[PDB]
Amino acid sequence: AALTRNPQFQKLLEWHRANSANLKLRELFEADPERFNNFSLNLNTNHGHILVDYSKNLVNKEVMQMLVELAKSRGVEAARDNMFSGSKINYTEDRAVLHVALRNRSNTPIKVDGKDVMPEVNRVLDKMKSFCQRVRSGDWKGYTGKSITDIINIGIGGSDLGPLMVTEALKPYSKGGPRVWFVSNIDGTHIAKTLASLSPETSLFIIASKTFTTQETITNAETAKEWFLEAAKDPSAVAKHFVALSTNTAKVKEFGIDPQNMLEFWDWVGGRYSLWSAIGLSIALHVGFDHFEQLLSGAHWMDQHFLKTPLEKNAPVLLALLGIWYINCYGCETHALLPYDQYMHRFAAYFQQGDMESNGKYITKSGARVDHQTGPIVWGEPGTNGQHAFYQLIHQGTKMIPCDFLIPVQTQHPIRKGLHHKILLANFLAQTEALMKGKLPEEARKELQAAGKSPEDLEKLLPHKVFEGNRPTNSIVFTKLTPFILGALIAMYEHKIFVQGIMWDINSFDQWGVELGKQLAKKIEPELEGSSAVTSHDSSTNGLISFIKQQRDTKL
Amino acid sequence: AALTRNPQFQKLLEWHRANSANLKLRELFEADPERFNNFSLNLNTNHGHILVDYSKNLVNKEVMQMLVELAKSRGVEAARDNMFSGSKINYTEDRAVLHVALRNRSNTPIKVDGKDVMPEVNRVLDKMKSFCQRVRSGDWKGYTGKSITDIINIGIGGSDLGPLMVTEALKPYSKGGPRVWFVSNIDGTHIAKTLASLSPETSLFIIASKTFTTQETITNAETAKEWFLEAAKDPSAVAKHFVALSTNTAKVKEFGIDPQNMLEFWDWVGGRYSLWSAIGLSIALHVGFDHFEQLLSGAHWMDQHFLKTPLEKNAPVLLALLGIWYINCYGCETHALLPYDQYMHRFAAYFQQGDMESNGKYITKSGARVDHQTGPIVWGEPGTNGQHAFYQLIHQGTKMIPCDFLIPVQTQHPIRKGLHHKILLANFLAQTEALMKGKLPEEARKELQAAGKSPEDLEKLLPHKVFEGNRPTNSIVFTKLTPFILGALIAMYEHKIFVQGIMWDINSFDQWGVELGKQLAKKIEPELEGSSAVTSHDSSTNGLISFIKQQRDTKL
């Protein structure tokens, strides 16, 4: 594999073997008073600041140098330029990778097969704006002539997580907008419980699916149509209550959607990089097109930062490099995203797809199997909640877990004269300090003595009360979680993932690994129908099917 | 450390070293048509069946025998009996561990300090029953004489995750009950957004906290009381609108609630094992006391299963052992919980606390520092959602990830004549089959051939289409997700966690690891006030504080 054969990697690895055990965060800060200054990036976007403080990491000047050199010798600069220019860097599918084009506010032409994609991008954006005016103003009428009060996005994966996460995060920007609902699971609970809260007269469905043949999405869409038609009793009324985000004109028409309300996107828009496209319709409907444009503008700002900035001070590049250090040298399986923001409660889940489906790969560009780790398992819950759930293990378990802590300085809800946010900030700060510093036996001993512990109880409790510390974190602090700043933040992680994939020599933009489960599911589906025993699989699959057939008739 | 010094563990590890490379799931299944029958448990609870199918794991008869021998040698059965009889097995806090007493439907005596706890457990349950009747019937009136429409649980961690996960999971059982809301984060967004949708006249607050000193919960409760009193203007009206669930009567009184308006629990109820106690009040209010009793009863059934069943046929024991195999022999950092059930959408998040806070430990009963792994990182999203997010990595990344797949046979919403559930089941079944089976180079080659691919296109695409398989899963399938069955499932995992903690020689029931973060946050709190530079910490904490102060008053 290219990474393992790379001399900059081998040097980094040998340095780790010889010196990593020596690295103590406490000592690193003690030896260097400029540590925060030299291991952080204060980004002024002109729409707020983003501070990426990576100083609480197990790195020094040499390590960062070794890491930047690796990025260079793995071709990160060339690959990035190739992405931005419309080159077909999705090499297994032979496709361009152009989520950057979707938010290319500068409108500098980006060509795919000799043709600028910007006119088409902007045409769909114009359609989205017009759509939003019609719906938000109440001008768009339902089949009984009433304004729309609820929007229901129906989609899976990239058609669901992005719009969900962003509408949750930008909820304060939704005054005057319709309520937004997300249906994704094929589990009939999801659509059934959504529809129970809705009126057919005032509900508008967005069916998000490029092919318009996605089984889960289309099944959900058809169930919605059936519920709708029970009330409307007129097939021509479907066009007032269903729109599509798709390129399959024929299938969309067949469903009963006016092809005017089919908003297009392109094969160079990956599902997990799609919220910036027509797929963001539910976002624009919820918060308004102006706020949607701001979100796009924030991403564009970060795209430019990533394109133009030298690697040593390039935010997504440094985030990528620190990850490579933890993944390929320390062997850390996971990466935690810990946003101290209740609005960002689905941020971690979003990057589970964005990161894991991108870089959960094992075949390189040459066709060779990797002989090293690739993408990590991404997880997290918002702070402070996580502190009362799993931080016990982060502080005192047996796992090394790189954590990104994120927070806005300014809250959307400065209640009680800022008291809640003061406490939230203090916890954000205290946790990374605690993870770094720990608590020494001498510090814990004084606490037990003051608590009045006997000699034997003291000695028994002492080791339990010690925190070893030396647990590395990033702290990412930003002025306020506005649409612009959120856009920047998402793009930053998109570009982190990109850099990591190049360094691993893998394709961040395909998803061949979802195919087998889809194939096998299609085979099992019709086998479940009848009463006959299924014997066509391994004994477990057969045994599980037998149990299902037996238990589905049981009356409880 | 006891585990690594144990000869049965040494035997298991050595066997793994010599032989585990030769374990191939596809081949195990082909060679043994009895595999499912011999590596699965079909439990009949008399209120539904639970099938625990562990056949798709990297084990054979010998491995299971060695694992069972290890559990015996690590004293699992004696430790279990000690838990059940009220021995103070939480040795660092010198406390009993008696969540099993909370659901002890048999009412057999369990003594702490020579005194049966059962009378007090049942007294509180009776008070819960009485209160729920008064509220749900509409008899309990607010300060303006209106029935209660909204219940708001305020609490965090163990006082939040259980009630939240259970009311979500048991949502079909809440018809006619009041709406329930969960406020947990200190982040002011959480309470602000919740209060925005409520009327003080018709809202009942439940303040849930073991200590009643938790910063987040007390601050939230004080904000709620301030909001309430702004409307009610009558301190005596607090008794109609606030109920406390605590062990700390004095702090409850201090906050401003009379013990009459307090439902108590006991120090031997760990926060993360507390939903079965007074803490489950919001569950009982939402779904009714009868359904809450059925939840307790299901846990009791599983308690009795765990207590009375030989190790080699004991469900939580076998799950625990498989985990030990993957954690301590294969070195897998994580464990994924993947319920194919939208109602169970918070099940994984609950067990992040249950598992990680219990077993994220590094000191043994002897005072030894472990030289082996302890608790895993728990994560997951419900299927099919998680399936469209991160399964790419599970199938084709570079991590071994033990997964538990869970599904009810019978759906709560059999819409479209069962079509949605049929598809859901097919996916549940196909994914584990796929993870087990994979797709060999020669199989993918033939598919590409049949697809009309050229030898040129075929050979470049081929390796990307290969699934190595041999990825182990558990499938846990149950008749229906009723309150009883859910109670049995939660207890099963509680006991898996217990068995693992015993085998690791750690205390599953303390949490010293959350203390440091709380202490450092209390120090940072006053430093945030005013405009002066903070220089008291490391340069990163100092620098983040400076950024916060600088950016506080930026008018975006």
Q: Is B211 marked as a binding-site residue? A: yes
Q: What's the alpha-carbon Rg for chain B, to the nearest Å?
A: 26
Q: Is A209 marked as a binding-site residue? A: yes
Q: Which is the catalytic residue, given A216, A264, A293, A357?
A: A357
Q: Give yes or no for B411 touching A (CB within 8 A).
A: yes
| Residue from the list B161, B374, B399 with its beta carbon closest to the beta carbon of A398 | B374
Q: Is B209 marked as a binding-site residue? A: yes
Judged by CB atoms closer than 8 Å, whether chains meet at B188 and A416 is answered as: yes
Judged by CB atoms closer than 8 Å, whether chains meet at B427 and A56 is answered as: no
Backbone angles phi, psi at B23, to 5 degrees: -80, 120
Residues 6+ apart with CB under 8 A from A386: A338, A380
Judged by CB atoms closer than 8 Å, whether chains meet at A352 and B480 is answered as: no
The answer to whether the beta carbons of residues B337 and B401 sit under 8 Å apart is: no
Q: Give yes or no for A385 touching B (CB within 8 A).
A: yes
Written as six digits, the tokens of B108 are: 């057999």
**What distance lies between CA B402 and its chain's CA centroid?**
17
Q: Which chain B residues contact residue A338 at CB under 8 A? A: none
> What is the second-level CATH architecture of the domain A515-555?
Orthogonal Bundle (1.10)
Task: For CA atoms B57, B63, B64, B68, give the dihedral sign.
Answer: negative
Judged by CB atoms closer than 8 Å, whether chains meet at A397 and B92 is answered as: no
Distances (CA, A) of A321 to A54, A371, A500: 11, 19, 7
Closest by Cα among B204, B92, B398 to A460: B92
Q: Give yes or no for A533 touching B (CB within 8 A).
A: no
Judged by CB atoms closer than 8 Å, whether chains meet at A193 and B413 is answered as: yes
Per the DSSP assignment, residues forming a β-bridge with B404 are B337, B474
Backbone angles phi, psi at A385, to 5 degrees: -50, -45
Q: Do domains A1-98+294-514 and A99-293 have the same CATH topology?
A: yes
| Residue from the list A353, A377, A479 with its beta carbon closest to the beta carbon of B334 | A377
The experimental method, as deposited, was: X-ray
A99-293: CATH homologous superfamily?
Answer: Glucose-6-phosphate isomerase like protein; domain 1 (3.40.50.10490)
Name the residue ranges covered by the structural domains of chain A.
1-98+294-514, 99-293, 515-555
* Residue positions counted in chain A: 556
The answer to whether the beta carbons of residues B177 and B148 sit under 8 Å apart is: no
* CATH top-level class of A1-98+294-514: alpha beta
Q: What's the alpha-carbon Rg for chain A, to the nearest Å?
A: 26
Interface test mutation site (partner A, options B218, B340, B538, B546, max chain A beta carbons within 10 A): B538
| Residue from the list B214, B372, B429 with its beta carbon closest to the beta carbon of A524 | B429
| Residue from the list B215, B332, B412 with its beta carbon closest to the beta carbon of A423 | B215
Between CA B81 and CA B98 the distance in angstroms is: 12
Residues 6+ apart with CB under 8 A from B15: B62, B63, B66
In the residue annotation, A527 being an active-site residue is answered as no
Q: Is B212 marked as a binding-site residue? A: yes
Q: Is B357 marked as a binding-site residue? A: yes
* Residue ranges of B 73-102 with Cβ closer than 8 A to chain A: 92
Closest chain B residue to the Cα of A161, Cα to Cα: B389
The answer to whether the beta carbons of residues A136 and A187 sit under 8 Å apart is: no
Residues 6+ apart with CB under 8 A from A170: A283, A286, A287, A291, A295, A343, A481, A483, A486
Residues 6+ apart with CB under 8 A from B206: B151, B152, B153, B154, B155, B242, B243, B244, B245, B281, B282, B285
**What distance lies between CA A132 and its chain's CA centroid?**
25
In the residue annotation, A77 being an active-site residue is answered as no
End-to-end CA distance of chain B: 56
* Residue ranges of B 363-382 with Cβ closer than 8 A to chain A: 363, 367, 369-370, 372-379, 381-382
Nearest CA-CA distance, residue B514 and chain A, Å = 6
Interface test mutation site (partner A, options B464, B507, B523, B542, max chain A beta carbons within 10 A): B464
Written as six digits, the tokens of A530 are: 């009848």
Between CA B357 and CA B186 the distance in angstroms is: 20
Q: Transcribe A136-203 into DSSP letters.
A: HHT-SB-TTSPBP-EEEEE--GGGTHHHHHHHHHTGGGGTTSPEEEEE--SSHHHHHHHHTT--TTTE
Residues 6+ apart with CB under 8 A from B17: none
Q: Transcribe A213-248 into DSSP letters.
A: --HHHHHHHHHHHHHHHHHH--GGGGGGTEEEESS-
Resolution of the experimental structure, in angstroms = 1.6
Backbone angles phi, psi at B58, to 5 degrees: -80, 70
Q: Is A541 marked as a binding-site residue? A: no
Interface test mutation site (partner A, options B324, B385, B536, max chain A beta carbons within 10 A): B385
**What distance lies between CA A509 and its chain's CA centroid?**
14
User: Helix B188-195 and helix B215-232: axis angle, to 10°?
Assistant: 30
